[PDB]
């Protein structure tokens, strides 16, 4: 019903003919039923291509319940969605970083820090950012992460990039993004001692 | 406290105005002029405005002690020199004027004393050297400390020397440094510029709560 061809959609109808739906406007559910277990058959599967505008301005009628019992399961085809359905211009998949990510980054430390998500994860991050490793909220979470939490790794690779091309653009980002940004930047490179890069 | 134009008066001197018992008594005429100057001068003009000094002869010829003072402090016996230096120390306190700069004057003094006998040398000796300023050892050498504040060769000291070696040679490979250095934070800026560009046109700011 709610998915007939909308499963058909993200399986079948991304980069097809007027099938343009979720993409454009931007997460442990994405229908909140009894069968949120049906919320894992295809989604993470294959790319987040030009398959954009549409179904998500349809489907923002339910917005509940972004933390269902998925937290491995549906997380499982997500960490899928970073290595097989990472996309096509995965800035917007920010939406279920911002909705569930975050909602995952609560429960992080909240369990212990983030034990799952970062090593694959980081790969529809970088699918995300295009370029410069260009500038996300994902740093954020991560990078307060590897500041405060005892693993400094993952972003080891994105030190000192001189990264950019931020997404406003229909939100995408916030203040607080940047703001932890170079915060978690000075406050590393005090731990990591290159005390200039973060004064800078 | 612009003491050039003041000594650039100094000189000018005219005993054919010859009387003013407001003016400045030729004691304090001359002393007070040429040591203005003497703080002020640069050696070679002074010594122009000094040992060919004619407008002045008069204001020259007036106190010997200052006279002679200056010549043999050009000269360098810097000991006594020094010496009715800080003794004249408590007369220009008497001057009430001499008074207000004393610290001024006596600071500019013993450091150009140092500028005099310092420049031609390559490795700073104390010890007779020592002998004559009549600085005790640390006391000499933390003169030398003061130095190093603000000091223009690139000097060092074996304390067991009691020595300084002066500056040093190639200014070529300094150049080299600031011009990393240079480099450095010119890369610096402009990534930070490249950012800036970013924040600006990513419409980005703070807003106020």
């Known amino acids: 019903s709610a998915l007939e061809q909308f499963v058909n959609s ?20 994405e229908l909140l ?13 294959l790319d987040v291509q030009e398959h954009s505008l549409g179904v998500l301005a349809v489907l923002f009628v339910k917005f509940s319940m972004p933390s269902v019992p998925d937290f491995e399961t549906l997380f499982s085809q997500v960490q899928l969605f970073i290595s097989t359905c990472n996309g096509e211009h995965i800035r917007y998949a920010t939406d279920t970083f911002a909705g569930l990510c975050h909602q995952l980054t609560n429960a992080l430390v909240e369990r212990k820090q983030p034990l799952r998500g970062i090593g694959i994860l980081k790969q529809a991050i970088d699918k995300m950012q295009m370029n410069t490793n260009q500038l996300t909220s994902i740093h954020a979470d991560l990078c307060q992460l590897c500041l405060l939490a005892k693993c400094f790794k993952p972003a080891l690779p994105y030190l000192d990039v ?39 | 406290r ?41 050696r070679q003009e002074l010594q122009r405005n000094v040992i060919s000094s004619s407008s002045f002869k008069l204001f020259l010829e007036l106190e010997p002690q200052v006279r002679d003072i200056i010549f043999k402090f050009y000269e360098s016996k810097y000991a006594s020199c020094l010496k009715m230096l800080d003794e004249m120390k408590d007369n220009l306190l008497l001057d009430m004027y001499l008074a207000p700069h004393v610290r001024t004057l006596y600071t500019q003094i013993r450091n150009r004393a140092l500028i005099q006998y310092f420049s031609p040398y390559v490795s700073a000796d104390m010890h007779r050297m020592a002998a004559a300023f009549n600085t005790t050892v640390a006391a000499l050498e933390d003169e030398l400390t003061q130095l190093i504040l603000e000091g223009l060769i690139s000097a060092r000291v074996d304390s067991h020397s009691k020595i300084l070696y002066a500056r040093d040679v190639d200014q070529r490979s300094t150049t080299f440094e600031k011009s990393l250095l240079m480099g450095k934070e010119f890369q610096r800026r402009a990534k930070a510029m490249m950012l800036r560009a970013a924040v600006l046109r990513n419409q980005i700011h703070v807003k106020s709560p």
């Open chain 1, 162 to 200: 001189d990264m950019m091309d931020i997404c406003k653009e229909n939100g995408a980002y916030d203040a607080k993004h940047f703001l932890c940004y170079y915060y978690y930047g000075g406050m590393i490179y005090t731990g990591l001692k290159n005390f200039e890069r973060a004064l800078y």
């Open chain 1, 33 to 45: 039923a009894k069968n949120l277990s049906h919320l894992d058959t295809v989604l993470g599967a």
């Open chain 2, 2 to 42: 612009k003491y050039k134009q003041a000594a650039k008066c100094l000189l000018l001197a005219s005993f054919d105005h010859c009387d003013f018992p407001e003016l400045l008594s030729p004691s304090n005429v001359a002393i007070y002029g040429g040591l203005c100057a003497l703080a002020t001068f640069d």
């Open chain 1, 10 to 29: 993200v399986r079948q109808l991304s980069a097809q003919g007027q099938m343009t739906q979720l993409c454009e406007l931007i997460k442990s559910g």
